[PDB]
Amino acid sequence: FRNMYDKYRDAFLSHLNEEEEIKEHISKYYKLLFDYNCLGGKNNRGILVILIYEYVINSSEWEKAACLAWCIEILQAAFLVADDIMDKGEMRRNKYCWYLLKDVETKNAVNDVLLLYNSIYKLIEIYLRNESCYVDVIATFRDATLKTIIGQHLDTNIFSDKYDAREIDVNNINVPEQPVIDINMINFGVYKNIVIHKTAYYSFFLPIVCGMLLAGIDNLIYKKIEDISMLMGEYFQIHDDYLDIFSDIQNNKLTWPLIKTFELCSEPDKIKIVKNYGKNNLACVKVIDSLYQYKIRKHYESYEKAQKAKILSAINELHHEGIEYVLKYLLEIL
Amino acid sequence: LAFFRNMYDKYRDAFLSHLNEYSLEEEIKEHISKYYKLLFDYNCLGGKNNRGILVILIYEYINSSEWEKAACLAWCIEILQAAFLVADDIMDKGEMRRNKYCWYLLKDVETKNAVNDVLLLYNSIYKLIEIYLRNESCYVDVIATFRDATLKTIIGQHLDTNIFSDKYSDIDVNNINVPEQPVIDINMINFGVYKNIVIHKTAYYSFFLPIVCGMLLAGIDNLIYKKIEDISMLMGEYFQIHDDYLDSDIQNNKLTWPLIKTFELCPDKIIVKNYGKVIDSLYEQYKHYESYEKAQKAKILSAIELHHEGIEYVLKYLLEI
Ligand SMILES: CCCCCCCCOc1cc(O)cc(CSc2ccccc2C(=O)O)c1
Ligand SMILES: CCCCCCCCOc1cc(O)cc(CSc2ccccc2C(=O)O)c1
Numbered sequence: 001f002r003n004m005y006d007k008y009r010d011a012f013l014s015h016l017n018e019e020e021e022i023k024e025h026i027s028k029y030y031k032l033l034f035d036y037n038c039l040g041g042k043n044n045r046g047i048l049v050i051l052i053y054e055y056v057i058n059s060s061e062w063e064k065a066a067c068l069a070w071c072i073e074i075l076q077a078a079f080l081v082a083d084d085i086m087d088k089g090e091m092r093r094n095k096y097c098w099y100l101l102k103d104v105e106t107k108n109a110v111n112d113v114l115l116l117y118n119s120i121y122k123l124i125e126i127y128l129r130n131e132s133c134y135v136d137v138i139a140t141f142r143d144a145t146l147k148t149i150i151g152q153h154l155d156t157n158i159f160s161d162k163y164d165a166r167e168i169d170v171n172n173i174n175v176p177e178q179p180v181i182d183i184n185m186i187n188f189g190v191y192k193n194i195v196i197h198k199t200a201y202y203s204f205f206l207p208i209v210c211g212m213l214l215a216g217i218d219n220l221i222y223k224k225i226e227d228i229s230m231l232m233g234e235y236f237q238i239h240d241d242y243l244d245i246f247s248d249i250q251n252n253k254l255t256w257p258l259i260k261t262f263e264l265c266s267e268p269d270k271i272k273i274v275k276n277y278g279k280n281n282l283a284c285v286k287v288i289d290s291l292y293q294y295k296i297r298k299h300y301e302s303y304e305k306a307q308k309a310k311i312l313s314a315i316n317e318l319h320h321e322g323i324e325y326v327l328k329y330l331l332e333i334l
Numbered sequence: 335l336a337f338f339r340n341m342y343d344k345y346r347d348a349f350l351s352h353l354n355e356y357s358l359e360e361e362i363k364e365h366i367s368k369y370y371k372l373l374f375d376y377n378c379l380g381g382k383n384n385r386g387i388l389v390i391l392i393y394e395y396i397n398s399s400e401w402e403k404a405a406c407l408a409w410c411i412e413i414l415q416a417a418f419l420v421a422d423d424i425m426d427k428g429e430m431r432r433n434k435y436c437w438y439l440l441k442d443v444e445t446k447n448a449v450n451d452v453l454l455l456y457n458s459i460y461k462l463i464e465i466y467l468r469n470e471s472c473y474v475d476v477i478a479t480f481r482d483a484t485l486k487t488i489i490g491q492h493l494d495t496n497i498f499s500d501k502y503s504d505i506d507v508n509n510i511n512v513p514e515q516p517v518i519d520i521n522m523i524n525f526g527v528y529k530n531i532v533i534h535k536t537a538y539y540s541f542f543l544p545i546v547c548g549m550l551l552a553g554i555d556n557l558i559y560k561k562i563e564d565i566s567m568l569m570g571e572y573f574q575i576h577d578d579y580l581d582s583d584i585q586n587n588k589l590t591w592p593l594i595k596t597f598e599l600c601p602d603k604i605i606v607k608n609y610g611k612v613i614d615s616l617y618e619q620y621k622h623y624e625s626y627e628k629a630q631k632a633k634i635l636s637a638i639e640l641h642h643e644g645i646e647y648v649l650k651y652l653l654e655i
Contacts, residue, residue, distance in 0.1 A: 019530060036507065111491050121481050125481075142461065146461065149454045170434070170435070171435075173435050174441065193362055196357070197356070
């Protein structure tokens with residue numbers, strides 16, 4: 001996989017490359033945009049396409065599968081660039097975030113998101129325009145992205161001022177909304193709504209469905225895969241929330257640990273939480289951290305056991321030895 | 335007409351419905367709606383709608399089902415326009431757009447949302463086209479037209495943003511310290527480059543796309559598309575240049591027509607010390623626009639050798655308005 005990279009980068013660079021001085025500057029820039037942001041990640045989404053396809057093969061077919069696999073990694077790159085803009089991040093994959101670079105800046109990074117994003121659909125035209133799944137593939141990418149955009153919306157706004165059912169001041173361009181958690185949003189239903197949309201569709205559903213469509217599978221097994229994907233996304237974002245404890249607390253994010261602590265702590269501790277969650281002051285966080293007291297460590301281990309079981313149960317009702325093997329596999333390496 | 339402007343709520347609500355069919359909780363769905371209805375309303379309405387009407391005109395030159403599909407494409411262009419405006423304002427750090435505050439400036443919105451909202455508006459387009467034209471034979475071609483124009487636009491934007499920048503000289507992935515102070519580069523101050531920028535940044539999506547949209551839906555592939563591409567390239571220029579004439583362009587260190595015309599014509603070049611912060615008085619110093627508009631209008635009418643009385647009429651018409 002990691003070998004095929006240059007081929008797809010260059011095919012798109014080629015597309016762009018049809019005044020000479022200008023063409024040359026464009027290339028130096030866009031090659032870096034690709035290299036800087038597409039390489040360096042673990043590539044789980046990418047390999048998943050290749051694995052699922054394999055288990056459901058001449059060189060031409062790999063060419064097409066590896067294309068889809070790389071298009072996922074591009075999508076990922078686009079999301080990381082955008083998310084770092086939005087969250088005002090510092091570090092990503094142990095380098096500076098793209099937008100932070102003096103030769104890049106926020107102005108270019110925005111434009112670059114749209115570029116990466118659209119690059120995907122061009123590469124799919126180059127390699128799969130004639131395949132019968134073509135239209136379905138481009139649709140999968142579109143629908144997964146839309147779901148991701150909504151999941152991102154929610155994650156950004158769940159505790160925000162705009163969330164009665166007061167509307168938006170199209171005249172207030174000044175003053176800020178003193179980041180303040182909203183106890184009404186601190187429940188599992190909402191969290192799942194965010195986590196499923198923000199991560200499950202593009203991290204699991206998309207790659208699997210890509211590998212399945214190319215292979216010729218529409219059939220009632222896609223909805224089975226959607227549900228497994230929903231389950232995996234949760235299992236997994238929640239894992240991530242467990243680690244980012246050992247910026248989210250100051251970044252005022254809805255996390256699993258936050259919700260578990262809330263449904264579990266005494267009416268007086270809930271108030272401490274509200275006074276310290278998301279605020280700048282270090283005493284405030286050193287303290288949420290100490291509330292995590294309710295042995296969140298242990299409550300995770302309990303959830304991981306139970307959720308892993310829910311995931312395996314749904315996989316065994318799939319009736320496809322090849323896909324079952326891959327998903328059992330990914331659930332070990334995820 | 336304002337028949338077009340009437341169809342608006344239908345397409346906005348179709349896409350809002352799509353969202354409202356997601357696996358979410360009712361309270362959450364309600365907030366989502368409130369927000370996205372505003373994103374559409376605030377950014378899609380208020381414009382002149384030339385790109386929109388162009389689709390409807392070209393197509394016309396018809397039962398209700400056909401309008402439904404053509405007005406879809408027409409609105410999709412206006413949504414595209416909305417997304418480009420939102421994005422451009424973030425990039426150029428703008429203040430006012432259509433005589434209100436820019437979307438991203440709003441305290442309930444901020445840069446963090448606006449970015450995400452550009453992607454949402456953009457993708458909304460392709461969903462609307464699935465809804466209204468999934469079964470049409472031109473479907474695949476239509477979605478590609480939108481894709482290719484966007485890509486050209488994106489490149490045009492890249493150029494417009496960077497033509498005078500530090501990296502364009504005869505990238506440091508470790509420098510994150512406030513950017514270099516902006517300086518024009520005399521090497522870039524020529525017509526070739528400017529047409530490169532203006533063609534890509536505006537011509538494909540403002541002219542080519544809406545015309546090709548009206549053409550594909552109508553059943554025209556044929557060798558007349560490349561004719562339309564060229565007219566479209568020409569109009570793009572004719573028109574960005576007009577906008578340069580009305581023109582914070584000097585202040586924003588932008589490559590403009592007046593800048594290039596003055597440069598090829600003017601010790602005065604050493605412009606370099608004041609552009610991007612008297613430039614104004616260098617312009618009244620050196621009428622040349624009125625000369626170009628007469629010549630370019632002629633070049634455009636001459637190309638409209640199209641052999642199609644219906645299309646020719648509309649293009650002659652748009653060139654007036
Ligand atoms: C339109 C707005 C875009 C919204 C998209 C939000 C993106 C955040 O969702 C994520 C959540 C996670 O838990 C993990 C990851 C990637 S794994 C990863 C993580 C860090 C570094 C490298 C990698 C790597 O393997 O490539 C993504
Ligand atoms: C993602 C890459 C970023 C893309 C950036 C593309 C730049 C888009 O900005 C513009 C370009 C133009 O050539 C003209 C206009 C104003 S026309 C207009 C203005 C306000 C209302 C209605 C209209 C109308 O003619 O319908 C704006």
